[PDB]
């Protein structure tokens, strides 16, 4: 034994003498673990960054649309119904506040936002538009619904916005990040670790300097190490469910709200009789495409993974003058965490 880069070992099969002790054998074992990890990391890095990219972009891309619709709706009220301000500035704000909240997962009932909107809207119409000239507010809020002053305009808006706000209310992007990030942390069996050590490092224990492991030996070893991991391939390919969803807006619906609200005109068509009774009573899509394009190029990630480890490590794919795990030969002859990834790949929710 020069520079290296009896017998009672527990990994390297000693044909005779050996250059390494039980302690250098344990060194070689931990560096195999570190090496496999780095290789898995490198395999998953480009895909991991791709989904991290788009998850950050797409998340920022809806709050802008809600702010823009709010200001447009506020401006249209200021310009066309100045007698309804500043009260309109308040119930418009109340509604679009709930819009964003509902988008981002809060417990918000859409039929409210619409109903609170029209419950807040009708008293100021009555007092300022229909019969110009505070204690009587609550009667008018109740008579709004008891007398159905807006007809089916609230229901129309309810269905218009509930359909668009439900679809907008990311899980799959973040889950892909979470499974792919799990891959570089996969713990393998102890037998796989002993075999990885024999494949990569035990040749140095026999005193060889340049000999590389046979590719065939690498595949038998890798197919044995990644036996549970390859089962994930079919669930990862079922990418396709994501491609199905991207069947796909909220801007037009929210921008169109003032027009529908203005068609107020219905109510005033009945101001005459209605007053009397109340008197008595009281590139985005382009980004989706490019993501799916790049994502399909990684559809074989879990099936190509054992070949990646073998190809991105020094091997004699020629299977000549190579290390078989215990001797230099002339020609080579012969789950929990995994199941959680399977279970999560639940998301295949993707019931377009």
């Amino acid at each position, epitope marked *: 034994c020069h520079q290296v880069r009896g017998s009672d070992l527990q990994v390297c099969l000693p044909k005779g003498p050996t250059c390494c002790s039980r302690k250098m054998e344990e060194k070689y074992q931990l560096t195999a673990r570190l090496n496999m990890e780095q290789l898995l990391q490198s395999a998953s890095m480009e895909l991991k960054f791709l989904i991290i990219q788009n998850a950050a972009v797409f998340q920022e891309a809806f709050e802008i649309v809600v702010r823009h619709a709010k200001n447009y709706t506020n401006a249209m009220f200021k310009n066309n119904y100045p007698s309804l301000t500043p009260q309109a500035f308040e119930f418009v704000g109340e509604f679009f506040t709930d819009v964003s909240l509902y988008i981002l997962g809060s417990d918000i009932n859409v039929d409210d936002m619409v109903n609170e909107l029209f419950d807040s809207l009708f008293p100021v119409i009555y007092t300022q538009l229909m019969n110009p000239g505070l204690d009587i507010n609550e009667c008018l809020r109740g008579a709004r619904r008891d007398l159905k002053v807006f007809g089916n305009f609230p229901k*129309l808006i309810m269905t218009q916005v509930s359909k668009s706000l439900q679809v907008t209310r990311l899980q799959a992007l973040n889950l892909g990040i979470e499974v792919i990030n799990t891959t570089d942390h996969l713990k393998f069996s102890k037998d796989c670790g002993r075999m990885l050590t024999r494949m990569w490092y035990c040749s140095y224990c026999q005193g060889l300097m340049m000999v590389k492991p046979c590719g065939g030996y690498c595949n038998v070893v890798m197919q044995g190490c990644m036996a549970g991991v390859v089962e994930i391939d079919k669930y990862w390919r079922e990418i396709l469910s994501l491609e199905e969803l991207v069947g796909m807006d909220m801007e037009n619906v929210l921008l*169109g709200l003032f027009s529908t609200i203005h068609d107020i005109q219905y109510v005033q068509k009945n101001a005459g009789k209605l007053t009397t009774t109340i008197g008595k009573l009281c590139t985005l899509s382009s980004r989706r495409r490019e993501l799916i394009q790049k994502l399909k190029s990684f559809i074989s990630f879990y099936s190509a993974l054992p070949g990646y480890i073998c190809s991105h490590s020094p091997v004699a794919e020629n299977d000549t003058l190579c290390w078989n795990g215990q001797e230099l030969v002339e020609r080579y002859s012969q789950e929990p965490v995994v199941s959680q990834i399977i279970d999560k790949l639940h998301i295949n929710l993707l019931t377009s």
Partner: nanobody, 118 residues
């Protein structure tokens, strides 16, 4: 299901004519007569633009508006008994190529392709 359903799109030569028809379906049929109906065009690689609008009628007249690009060539009409809005398109030009959508303030159709080419 509530659907605005466009039809009558197709291929036509320059100077030809087409009639687009949009049918209001779903029991939207009750509000159609009180709804403004609109036709929009989306040319290839361009934004969607208003082509024609027709107001609700009082039984004697409809207020019709047209984009300047189609003025004197196109005619919007509506049949409240059938719940249809039609766009008669005459003296078609290559610039009239696009997907045509009927709309209301609450609903959009899926659109129909018009191609004006030799």
């Amino acid at each position: 299901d509530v659907q605005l359903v466009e039809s009558g799109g197709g291929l036509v030569q320059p100077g030809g004519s087409l009639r687009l028809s949009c049918v209001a379906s779903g029991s939207f049929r009750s509000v159609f007569s009180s709804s403004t109906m609109e036709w929009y065009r989306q040319p290839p690689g361009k934004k969607r633009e208003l082509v024609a609008r027709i107001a609700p009628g009082d039984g004697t007249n409809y207020g019709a508006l047209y984009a300047d690009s189609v003025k004197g060539r196109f005619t919007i009409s509506r049949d409240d008994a059938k719940k249809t809005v039609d766009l008669q398109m005459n003296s078609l030009k290559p610039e009239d190529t696009g997907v045509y959508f009927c709309a209301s303030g609450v609903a959009w159709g899926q659109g129909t392709l018009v191609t004006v080419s030799s």
